[PDB]
Amino acid sequence: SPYGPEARAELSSRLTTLRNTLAPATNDPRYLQACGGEKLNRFRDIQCRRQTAVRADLNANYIQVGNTRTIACQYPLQSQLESHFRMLAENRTPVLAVLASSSEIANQRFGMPDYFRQSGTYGSITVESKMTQQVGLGDGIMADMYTLTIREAGQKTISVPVVHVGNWPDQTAVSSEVTKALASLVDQTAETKRNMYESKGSSAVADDSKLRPVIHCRAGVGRTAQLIGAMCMNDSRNSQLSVEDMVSQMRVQRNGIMVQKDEQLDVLIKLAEGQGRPLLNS
Ligand SMILES: */C=C/S(=O)(=O)c1ccccc1
């Protein structure tokens, strides 16, 4: 069977070998390295692919699965906020999807700054956070939305649509119904903002490294990967892209953990089967 346990076991096998191969070795050439001793990676073993790094001081990667282009990153460290906001601004971010829970953010032991729900000043950058709408995704999962306006002297003021699922616990997978609802909402939000820039004749439209949806959570390899996978599967241009392709591409473009838990992979499998999308590559 195409979606039978034998097929699932084979997929899991192939991806496991890939994760182990991609594991970062000390001073790994494939991964972005910290500078002068200042922490770059929130987690020592969840690193950032150098070839696709967005900024030299952020754990963040440009990711292209099939035709879907995005940016995946870890929750910025307090010391990276300024550079983080810079990335968001320069990217003309059409949507910022944060899947880190409100509990994680609230726990000061985690060092996850409340940067998109609060207004403040960071270096020479000043940010305002306007709470907008709230959208249920099912099973009680809630999406809180905000408008993040980024201001800096001499720079074009940029406002960013934020989609925050604050009750999706770490290392777990919300149902495929919830995932599809979320991916639809994120893409929809992104399409509205991107359209705005295109109507204004923004030069960012001609730059493939810009206008990308930015997705992340705490480490940016689980809930983040699950959403990205769902998003690429919603792209009407990714016909024939298999789950194997999908997960391997995210892994080679960020790190080998992308799609952290089996439960998260299962959701991607389920969505694939729903569309008749192949799991393995022949
Ligand atoms: C998108 C966050 S996550 O990848 O799910 C994660 C965060 C912290 C620890 C493990 C996974």
Swiss-Prot record:
Swiss-Prot/TrEMBL catalytic activity: O-phospho-L-tyrosyl-[protein] + H2O = L-tyrosyl-[protein] + phosphate
Active site: C217
Any single Gene Ontology cellular-component annotation: extracellular region
Family (UniProt): Belongs to the protein-tyrosine phosphatase family. Non-receptor class subfamily.
Induction (free text): At 37 degrees Celsius in the absence of calcium.
KW Repeat (keyword) present: no
Part of the whole protein covered: 187 to 468 of 468
Record domain Tyrosine-protein phosphatase: where: 1-275
Main location: secreted
MF GO annotations: protein tyrosine phosphatase activity
Enzyme superclass (EC): hydrolase
Record note on quaternary structure: Monomer.
Enzyme Commission code(s) on record: 3.1.3.48
Function summary: Essential virulence determinant. This protein is a protein tyrosine phosphatase. The essential function of YopH in Yersinia pathogenesis is host-protein dephosphorylation. It contributes to the ability of the bacteria to resist phagocytosis by peritoneal macrophages.
UniProtKB keywords: Hydrolase, Plasmid, Protein phosphatase, Secreted, Virulence
Name under which the protein is recorded: Tyrosine-protein phosphatase YopH
Subcellular location: Secreted
